[PDB]
Amino acid sequence: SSQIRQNYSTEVEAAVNRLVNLYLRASYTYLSLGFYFDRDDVALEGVCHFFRELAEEKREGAERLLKMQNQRGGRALFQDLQKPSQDEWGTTLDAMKAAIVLEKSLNQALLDLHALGSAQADPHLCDFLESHFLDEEVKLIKKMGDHLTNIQRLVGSQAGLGEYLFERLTLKH
Amino acid sequence: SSQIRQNYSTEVEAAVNRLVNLYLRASYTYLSLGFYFDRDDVALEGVCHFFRELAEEKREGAERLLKMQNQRGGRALFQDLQKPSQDEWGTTLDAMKAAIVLEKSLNQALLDLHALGSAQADPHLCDFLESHFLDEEVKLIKKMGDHLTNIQRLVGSQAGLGEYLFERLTLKH
Amino acid sequence: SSQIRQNYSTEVEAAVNRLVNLYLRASYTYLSLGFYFDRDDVALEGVCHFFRELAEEKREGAERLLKMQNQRGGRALFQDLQKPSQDEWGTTLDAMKAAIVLEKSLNQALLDLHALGSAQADPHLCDFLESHFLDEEVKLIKKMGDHLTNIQRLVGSQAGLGEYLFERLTLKH
Amino acid sequence: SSQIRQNYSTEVEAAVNRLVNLYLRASYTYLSLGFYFDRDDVALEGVCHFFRELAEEKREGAERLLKMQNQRGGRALFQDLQKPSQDEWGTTLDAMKAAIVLEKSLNQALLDLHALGSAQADPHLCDFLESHFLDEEVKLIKKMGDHLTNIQRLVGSQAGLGEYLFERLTLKH
Ligand SMILES: Cc1ccc(C(C)C)cc1
Ligand SMILES: Cc1ccc(C(C)C)cc1
Ligand SMILES: Cc1ccc(C(C)C)cc1
Ligand SMILES: Cc1ccc(C(C)C)cc1
Ligand SMILES: [Ru+3]
Ligand SMILES: [Ru+3]
Ligand SMILES: [Ru+3]
Ligand SMILES: [Ru+3]
Ligand SMILES: [Ru+3]
Ligand SMILES: [Ru+3]
Ligand SMILES: [Ru+3]
Ligand SMILES: [Ru+3]
Ligand SMILES: [Ru+3]
Ligand SMILES: [Ru+3]
Ligand SMILES: [Ru+3]
Ligand SMILES: [Ru+3]
């Protein structure tokens, strides 16, 4: 059973399992994005790398949530990971827009869980998401917004040229 | 416009701009305090340094707030910085009392903003001020209270002697 | 009072206090410029950094002037810092033009003070501004003129592309 | 004779020789001050050291002036060094007041020489005193003013105690 569970509602436990699924789905979406930019007919290494980095970050988030679930005496329950929404992701601009939409959705889910935990009187969950999730999301979304603005400025006139330059001069390590 | 703003009210955005102005005004007040203690007819180096340190700390606080404003998709709006309340600051005791009053006012403004963000359901702002502002203020106010007590104990009898000794033995690096 | 003041007119003392206010206002303007280029819908890091660097340089200038004021036995008097002339600063070209106008105004104020000190027979002030101010201004204005020329050359045709390239290849550290 | 003299008036040459004599006399005064504070019935090591430091600084100033005299093709002419104005120098307060009076007199002599060189159209002399003399004097006079203020604050009530504390906590290395 559990010998440790204290002040941890079934509602929060369920919400945490949903958040795990959302973070893993986000990770899977970023894996698809990464390999799309690795196609020989796409071939934007900086972009591929940006998304592969995010795949790992999202997986790490899911893992931290699962660790927290066990620390509180809750029980992890996994669901299917739905395949990403697209098989082909278009331009770097299209991809960055999809990424922002995805991150905003995770952020909203975190805000929904915080509003649950506060309604459940759960201070620990509240300082857990605080912390390794809400702040990280804000910073990442700002970075993505900065990127979108730069990508948009570079769309001429000459979209191909701009796409190459962004990958070379902003993204590539 | 902004492509990133999420769960960030116009009320909080305005409050953050006000807090920026308050921190910069505090920085300006500490600049005035610092140079006052640098006067040849005042000449208390430890005291000058204590206040110049605080001028930089307050400026840094304003800058962190401005960074947060942009991270959330809010827009910085600057107002005039009102000149400090005094041109001459009296004794080290007078100056330390004015500093405590000033810090208490910043702290109260932070508490007012936290009470706004909670009423706005904004967990990120709440863990932003938590964090790099509320705890810092508490520690600084305690230090100032400790200093005031020591300064007061040293006021004889022989105020000049006590003022010199505090600067030499507590404040001076 | 002062026990040290020698060959230091009330007119020069007042002029120095005005110059302090001008340098601090310039610092505040550069702070506004810096955070504008940090907006998610502007997002030009090299430009943000260029202006934040200048904010610190101008503050440092004000501080050197205040130190000199006390060394001569004059008394610092602070005035309000007027908010910057704009809330939004347009393009990198607009911003660099505003910066040049601002620096030229500081330079003119330094030239006005030198012409005062010479009319006051004050050699020390004359070799103080010589020195840490006039030469610095000339070098900075030349750098800004160089930047403006490069920015202008890059305005096509394709203004977005040129703005990105200047930030990436000239400004960004 | 000289094969190098250019734009160097007999009036400036004479003024430089007078300044040499003034700096050497100041050095001699500081030597007397230093050894007075070394008396077994005075015994203030920090004070003795402060003045012995100044004796060396003033001698170094005289030497720089003599070097400049030869660089310009002028001819050094030495006069008697008048013995210092006092044989006993009283308290640290009395001594610091005498030192400030002495430095102000050197500064005034430098200002008189600058006003000569400008009336002689001598830019080199003007940037020579600028430079290794006028700025040094301003800084030293400020330091002395700071010291006087601290000494005065310490005169109770209990003059002996204050004199000891200043020597221990401000002056002594
Ligand atoms: C942040 C980060 C992640 C992965 C790498 C690889 C390319 C070594 C570099 C930086
Ligand atoms: C905390 C602090 C800040 C500034 C200094 C300067 C004097 C080096 C030292 C310590
Ligand atoms: C000149 C200068 C000023 C600041 C920095 C930061 C980015 C380290 C670098 C260079
Ligand atoms: C500035 C100075 C001059 C002399 C000494 C001696 C005591 C070593 C130390 C410092
Ligand atoms: Ru790859
Ligand atoms: Ru990487
Ligand atoms: Ru919370
Ligand atoms: Ru100081
Ligand atoms: Ru310090
Ligand atoms: Ru809170
Ligand atoms: Ru930045
Ligand atoms: Ru830099
Ligand atoms: Ru000049
Ligand atoms: Ru000795
Ligand atoms: Ru020494
Ligand atoms: Ru001159």
PDB file of N, CA and C and ligand atoms in Angstrom, chain A residues 49-50 52-53 171 173, ligand 6:
ATOM      1  N   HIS A  49      18.757  20.213 -33.405  1.00  0.00           N
ATOM      2  CA  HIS A  49      19.348  20.152 -32.086  1.00  0.00           C
ATOM      3  C   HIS A  49      18.504  20.844 -31.020  1.00  0.00           C
ATOM      4  N   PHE A  50      17.924  21.979 -31.387  1.00  0.00           N
ATOM      5  CA  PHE A  50      17.075  22.765 -30.481  1.00  0.00           C
ATOM      6  C   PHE A  50      15.938  21.835 -29.999  1.00  0.00           C
ATOM      7  N   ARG A  52      15.708  18.394 -30.216  1.00  0.00           N
ATOM      8  CA  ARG A  52      16.192  17.213 -29.488  1.00  0.00           C
ATOM      9  C   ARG A  52      16.533  17.578 -28.035  1.00  0.00           C
ATOM     10  N   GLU A  53      17.123  18.762 -27.828  1.00  0.00           N
ATOM     11  CA  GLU A  53      17.338  19.297 -26.476  1.00  0.00           C
ATOM     12  C   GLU A  53      16.022  19.364 -25.699  1.00  0.00           C
ATOM     13  N   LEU A 171      20.871  29.435 -33.854  1.00  0.00           N
ATOM     14  CA  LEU A 171      20.639  28.117 -33.224  1.00  0.00           C
ATOM     15  C   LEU A 171      21.821  27.167 -33.114  1.00  0.00           C
ATOM     16  N   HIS A 173      25.089  25.333 -32.456  1.00  0.00           N
ATOM     17  CA  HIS A 173      26.125  25.403 -31.439  1.00  0.00           C
ATOM     18  C   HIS A 173      27.475  25.752 -32.076  1.00  0.00           C
TER      19      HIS A 173
HETATM   20 RU    RU E   6      23.124  21.271 -27.079  1.00  0.00          RU
END
